[PDB]
Structures are given as C-alpha cells and as structure tokens.
Design an enzyme around this catalytic site. Structure first.
Site, PDB file in Angstrom:
ATOM      1  N   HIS A  27     -20.540 -40.038  19.215  1.00 28.16           N
ATOM      2  CA  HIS A  27     -21.904 -40.237  19.673  1.00 28.16           C
ATOM      3  C   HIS A  27     -22.717 -39.270  18.642  1.00 28.16           C
ATOM      4  O   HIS A  27     -24.142 -39.343  18.679  1.00 28.16           O
ATOM      5  CB  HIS A  27     -22.218 -39.536  21.044  1.00 28.16           C
ATOM      6  CG  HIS A  27     -22.014 -38.175  21.092  1.00 28.16           C
ATOM      7  ND1 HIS A  27     -22.769 -37.232  20.665  1.00 28.16           N
ATOM      8  CD2 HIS A  27     -20.950 -37.385  21.929  1.00 28.16           C
ATOM      9  CE1 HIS A  27     -22.182 -36.017  21.137  1.00 28.16           C
ATOM     10  NE2 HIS A  27     -20.943 -36.139  21.952  1.00 28.16           N
ATOM     11  N   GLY A  77     -24.883 -28.056  20.810  1.00 25.47           N
ATOM     12  CA  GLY A  77     -24.472 -27.901  19.453  1.00 25.47           C
ATOM     13  C   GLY A  77     -22.780 -27.651  19.480  1.00 25.47           C
ATOM     14  O   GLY A  77     -22.194 -27.871  18.468  1.00 25.47           O
ATOM     15  N   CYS A 121     -20.522 -29.911  20.720  1.00 25.63           N
ATOM     16  CA  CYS A 121     -19.748 -31.187  20.665  1.00 25.63           C
ATOM     17  C   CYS A 121     -19.036 -30.998  19.382  1.00 25.63           C
ATOM     18  O   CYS A 121     -19.189 -30.540  18.144  1.00 25.63           O
ATOM     19  CB  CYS A 121     -20.631 -32.269  20.694  1.00 25.63           C
ATOM     20  SG  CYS A 121     -21.576 -32.310  22.370  1.00 25.63           S
TER      21      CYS A 121
HETATM   22  O1  LIG Z   1     -23.495 -33.662  27.068  1.00 22.62           O
HETATM   23  C1  LIG Z   1     -23.973 -33.581  26.453  1.00 22.62           C
HETATM   24  N1  LIG Z   1     -23.702 -32.535  25.385  1.00 22.62           N
HETATM   25  C2  LIG Z   1     -23.495 -31.324  25.729  1.00 22.62           C
HETATM   26  C3  LIG Z   1     -22.436 -30.806  25.608  1.00 22.62           C
HETATM   27  N2  LIG Z   1     -21.846 -29.545  25.857  1.00 22.62           N
HETATM   28  C4  LIG Z   1     -22.727 -28.585  26.595  1.00 22.62           C
HETATM   29  C5  LIG Z   1     -24.021 -29.163  27.012  1.00 22.62           C
HETATM   30  C6  LIG Z   1     -24.473 -30.299  26.226  1.00 22.62           C
HETATM   31  C7  LIG Z   1     -25.825 -30.934  27.065  1.00 22.62           C
HETATM   32  N3  LIG Z   1     -26.684 -29.907  27.322  1.00 22.62           N
HETATM   33  C8  LIG Z   1     -25.883 -28.902  28.292  1.00 22.62           C
HETATM   34  C9  LIG Z   1     -24.849 -28.134  27.759  1.00 22.62           C
HETATM   35  C10 LIG Z   1     -24.596 -34.902  25.636  1.00 22.62           C
HETATM   36  C11 LIG Z   1     -26.316 -34.644  25.864  1.00 22.62           C
HETATM   37  C12 LIG Z   1     -26.926 -35.900  26.584  1.00 22.62           C
HETATM   38  O2  LIG Z   1     -25.906 -36.777  27.452  1.00 22.62           O
HETATM   39  C13 LIG Z   1     -24.702 -36.863  26.834  1.00 22.62           C
HETATM   40  C14 LIG Z   1     -24.152 -38.102  27.307  1.00 22.62           C
HETATM   41  C15 LIG Z   1     -22.904 -38.516  26.898  1.00 22.62           C
HETATM   42  C16 LIG Z   1     -22.230 -37.626  25.997  1.00 22.62           C
HETATM   43 CL1  LIG Z   1     -20.616 -38.129  25.465  1.00 22.62          CL
HETATM   44  C17 LIG Z   1     -22.633 -36.476  25.502  1.00 22.62           C
HETATM   45  C18 LIG Z   1     -23.953 -36.078  26.086  1.00 22.62           C
END
Ligand SMILES: O=C(Nc1cncc2c1CNCC2)[C@@H]1CCOc2ccc(Cl)cc21
Ligand SMILES: O=C(Nc1cncc2c1CNCC2)[C@@H]1CCOc2ccc(Cl)cc21
Ligand SMILES: [Cl-]
Lengths: 301, 305
Positions: free
Chosen positions: B41, B143, B145
């Site tokens: 992603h 950040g 991921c």
């Molecule tokens: O969830 C996600 N990332 C993220 C990762 N870890 C902690 C947090 C966040 C987001 N903000 C809160 C804290 C992204 C954001 C958008 O929606 C998606 C949809 C699918 C996927 Cl695979 C990833 C994401």
C-alpha cells in the site's frame, strides 16, 4: 492507537555486553570504549560475601585473573580500578560497537529498559521503573549480574542501572554506572530488605492521561480536588505524594486532553475508592505506575 | 525471580530497518540481502486505497519512484515486484548486517516481538501475541507501517509479521513476510472489523505455571479435571479449546512444578468460575494470555541469543 509497555530497541546495548570471569564467578560486563564495567562482587567467593573488604580482595588480583570474553574473542585486561561498587577493567581493545552514550543516575519513578544477559549474551529486553523504595521489579536469574538498564532518547544511550543483587522478596537492587547503589543497599550478603513500597502517583496519572488519549473516559468525574486533599487520600492507599513538580510535569498531557491535573487527581481518588467495577483501563484491571509522563508523550505522539 | 513481558533482543532486526518513500507516503521497509520488503500500500494515494488495483498502480511506477534510505545512505532501487500484499524492492547493495533469517507464518496464540519503527528508525520493542481473531494488540501510530514482528530461534531471526493497518477498535492487522494477511483482512480502505476474540488457554496455563515458579500458589487446589470437562468450562468463558497437543506442550512445566496439567486446569476452572477474590497473580488482576509455554521456560531458565 494502542498502549504497550515498550522498551527501547536494545541493539546499541547488545553490542556492549561481554562475559567477565574472576575465579569461579562469571557475570556480565558492559564494554564501552576500552573499559569493561561490572559489579565489583565478581572478585568475591560466596564465603567473602558477608563482610568483603573489596580494596583488600582487589589488591590481590592481577589483570590476568580477569577473563573477559566478547563473543568468541578474549579481550586482554591491561588495568583495573574500582569506583564505588563497580569494577572498571581496562582492556587493550576499544569496543568498535561503542554507541554514543552517557551515564545518568535516575530518580525513583523513572523508567528504563533492561537488557537481561547471561554469560555476556543478551536473553531479553523489558521495561522497568525505579520503585520509590529504590528496588526494581526485574526478571533476573543467577548469572544476570552486570545486566544493565538504559534509555535511548535520540541515538544516545543513557545507562542508568547495573544489576547487582536480588533481595529476599524477589525484587532487585543495583547501582548507577558510577557504582553508587540506588537505595540503602550494600553489596554484602548481610540481612537486607526492601522497604515498604508505594505506588508512583505521577506515573498513574500519566497512564490515565494515556487512557484518555486512547479514547477511554469512563473513569472521569465532575469533581476536582486540592493538591493537599489529594495527598491525604493518596497516602492512605500507599501512593507517593504528588508534588507541585509532578503537577507541572503533567501540564502538557493536561493541555492536550483538556483535563486539568487536579481534575485527573479526582478521578484517581475515585478509582482508589471504587476500584474498576469489572472495567479495564488500557487493558489493565490495576492502576499502572510504570509509565512516566515522558513515556506517555513519546508513545502517544 | 521476577516475571516480565519480555521481548527478544532487537539488534539483529534494527540493522535491517530502512525508510521507504513513494510519492507523499513514507513507511518502513525490511532490508535483507539485496531486497527491501514493505507493505504494497506504499504505492497508494488515499483515493487509491478506497479500491486499489495494485498491479495497475505498480506498473505505472519506475524504480526511481521508490526512495529507500538506510540510515543516512540512499539505496538504489533496481527492480520491483509484488508478492501478495508485500512489495519487494530489489536494491543494488546487499545489507551487510543481514542476520541468519527465515520467514515463518505463526499460528494464533504464538507470541512475537515487534520492533516499532518510524521513518526507518526503530523507536521501541514490545512483546505481543497473535490473537485468536488474527489481530495483534499493538502500539502503532501513523508511519509505523512496515514495522516487523519476529522471534529468535538460537541465532536465526524468524520474521513473522509486517504491520499494515489499524482497525477501528485500535487493534492491528498485518501480514507474514510472504505478504499473506493474518486474518480475513484486505489492504483496502473499506469497512473491516476485528471479530470476537477469545483467550489463549494454553498461554494462561503457562503463565499460571510461571506464577507457581515465582512463588505464587494461592490459586492451586486439591482438584483435577478431565480435558473434556475443562473444555466445556473453557467454551463457556470464551477461552480457546485446550487440545492434547497443548497438554503435551505444558508437560515440562507440569513436571518442574509438580502440578499436573489437568490439576492446573482445575485451578483455572475455579479462577474462571469465581474470580481472584481481590488477589493478584504475578502483579495482575486479569489472567494473562500473552506468554506461551516456551516463553515461560525461556524466561524462567535464561535462554540467550
Ligand atoms: O490503517 C492504516 N494505517 C495505520 C497503521 N498503524 C496505525 C495507524 C494507522 C492509521 N491511523 C491510526 C494509527 C492505513 C490508513 C488508512 O486505512 C488503511 C486501509 C488499509 C490499510 Cl492496509 C492501511 C490503512
Ligand atoms: O543476589 C545475588 N545475585 C542474584 C542476582 N539476580 C538474581 C538472583 C540472584 C541470586 N539468586 C536469585 C536470583 C547475589 C547472590 C548472593 O547474595 C548477594 C548479596 C549481595 C550481592 Cl551484591 C549479590 C548477591
Ligand atoms: Cl530521573
């Protein structure tokens, strides 16, 4: 989101752990530049532990009586000296993995990561707090002496603890990296005991702010309290007194959540009175006191 | 003595963390040999996330659209491919700090250490378990991921998790290092939810053995139970079923403490039916399920890496 007991990444410290042997005793040492730091009790037998005269025991040792192993490489000890309860072994090789570091003596309530080691090899990493009674509730077995506690705010390792002893209640005592013990403990096998411990109030408040930041507000109430009335109640539950310094330190979290420090104190007073009524706060059924205000801000931001 | 939630030493993994940027998105990558692994992603804008066609989005990218930074050194991307939900960026430099490693897919109930990273820089390490509902109760901000989960088996790092997403309840979802999600999750901004979770029974028993090893015995009793009667109780309290494999795995702890597995099951049965009565076990008022039997043996016996 989420709130975990989080340790600093241990890599910078792992590259400093060595094994130190003197006679039949083996423990861990911290190799920084050309010096290996370790508990001075490495020169004692179990017999010498009741009333050791460390100056007398040390003067009888030669450099070759200290065997230092860094991985599968023997380091050559070329000098030694004692600073308080720490032995400093000068070696002929500077540790090429020496990180940017400092020695800091912490205050009760402060947290740090512990890299538990055996035979100079890291086994695990966990988060500790220096209890108000100057002990730490660690996880240490025989051979763990010399394991260190540290913080790594930025890329500089601040070493704050070196493990020396386990008290009869299973809690731990150690020194800063200048060899000064935390608390009234001595590196002797004479009868010693942890004093009555108390809860780190400022840290419980910080963790309640972490819970609010993470969406949990069930414990909030319409009340406030004076600092003195809060302390009168706190002390009845064996909580540490909350000082104006602690109230000032909680300022940023208070501004961020919109909950005044004395308003959060009133929530804490109610939690001490009522318990949680089957509820949890950040996945805990007890009030957590091993997150500082600084830890909460770092983890939540 | 003492029993802490303990993570594996993270050094071997820290030497693999890099920053990966694609357009406006920055996240973490895992640099092993000449490949940087990261969530696929990374190539999506927020609009693409609504319904991404990753093959179509990826075909439009060039190697130079991926900026990989390892400390203060830019790595040159020389190829890119997708494996399930992970993007594999071929770089022109093998990571000299690549440890002995394997990619392993773990089962629910298994624990692992997470090295949370931001901008390719490790920020913290914590231990967690793969929940029975395939989420992890992590601590991750924007950040994070590409942060990874791992175990160490002797001198070998077994990478088992790469972080991809946070669900609405604040729990986390990710993939193994082959890009297969744990759980029925998809890498798309569409309505998704963590299913109802259960307690990892074998891990609670392991933690009760850890409590006994550490001197806490108040919960022990004279009773025993059958595996079938225990599972009837465990099902009633949203606990995972205990299998004969779990009973066998607890054998060593059962022999060390002198408490048979079904004897410990009778203590657990009574704890579920009656609560702790104001008492704690290893400093907890809840039954802890994020220590496996191997974690307990490792911590109470002092295994090093
Ligand atoms: O969830 C996600 N990332 C993220 C990762 N870890 C902690 C947090 C966040 C987001 N903000 C809160 C804290 C992204 C954001 C958008 O929606 C998606 C949809 C699918 C996927 Cl695979 C990833 C994401
Ligand atoms: O406590 C000590 N070490 C140790 C360290 N950490 C965990 C455990 C142990 C001991 N066995 C239980 C687990 C030694 C043993 C003898 O008594 C003393 C007295 C003073 C000093 Cl400085 C050190 C020691
Ligand atoms: Cl301090």
């Amino acid at each position: 989101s989420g709130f975990r007991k989080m340790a600093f990444p241990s890599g910078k410290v792992e590259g400093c752990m060595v094994q130190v042997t003197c006679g039949t005793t083996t423990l861990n040492g911290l190799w920084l530049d050309d010096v290996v730091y370790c508990p001075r009790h490495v020169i004692c037998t179990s017999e010498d532990m009741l009333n050791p005269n460390y100056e007398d025991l040390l003067i009888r040792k030669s450099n070759h009586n200290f065997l230092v192993q860094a991985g599968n490489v023997q380091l050559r000890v070329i000098g030694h000296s004692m600073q308080n309860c720490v032995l400093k072994l000068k070696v002929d090789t500077a540790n090429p993995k020496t990180p940017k570091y400092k020695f800091v003596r912490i205050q009760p309530g402060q947290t740090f990561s512990v890299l538990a080691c055996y035979n100079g090899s890291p086994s695990g990493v966990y988060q500790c707090a220096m209890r108000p009674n100057f002990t730490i509730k660690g996880s240490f077995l025989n051979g763990s002496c010399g394991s260190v506690g540290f913080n790594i705010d930025y890329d500089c390792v601040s070493f704050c603890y070196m493990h020396h002893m386990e008290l009869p209640t299973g809690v731990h005592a150690g020194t800063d990296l200048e060899g000064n013990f935390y608390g009234p403990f001595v590196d002797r096998q004479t009868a010693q005991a942890a004093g009555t411990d108390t809860t780190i109030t400022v840290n419980v408040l910080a963790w309640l702010y972490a819970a609010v930041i993470n969406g949990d507000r069930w414990f909030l109430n319409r009340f406030t309290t004076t600092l003195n009335d809060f302390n009168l109640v706190a002390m009845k539950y064996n909580y540490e007194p909350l000082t104006q310094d602690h109230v000032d330190i909680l300022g940023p979290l208070s501004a961020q959540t919109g909950i005044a420090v004395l308003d959060m104190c009133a929530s804490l007073k109610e939690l001490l009175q009522n318990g949680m009524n089957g509820r949890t706060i950040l996945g805990s059924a007890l009030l957590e006191d091993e997150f500082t205000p600084f830890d909460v801000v770092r983890q939540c931001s």
